[PDB]
């Protein structure tokens, strides 16, 4: 039991590592989506022309 609990805590820390990497990756994706939202709101401007839209 003692030896198994030691190895199990090692596995639990491995799981925390995986979750932490993935969760940190999703933050930059959120950030870029916010930027695209601003660009889309800026497209709704009756003074833009086709070059500005491009």
């Amino acid at each position: 039991q003692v030896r198994g609990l030691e190895v199990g805590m090692r596995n639990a820390n491995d799981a925390i590592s995986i979750a932490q990497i993935a969760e940190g990756a999703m933050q930059e994706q959120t950030n870029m989506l916010q930027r695209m939202r601003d660009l889309t709101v800026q497209s709704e401007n009756g003074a833009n022309s086709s070059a500005d839209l491009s």
Binding site: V41, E44, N45, G46, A47, S49
Partner: peptide, 17 residues
């Protein structure tokens, strides 16, 4: 700039969000 204003291009208005 280059878009005309008094020639009829805004006769049906444009929207600004």
């Amino acid at each position: 700039g280059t878009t005309k204003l008094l020639a009829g291009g805004f006769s049906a208005g444009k929207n600004f969000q």
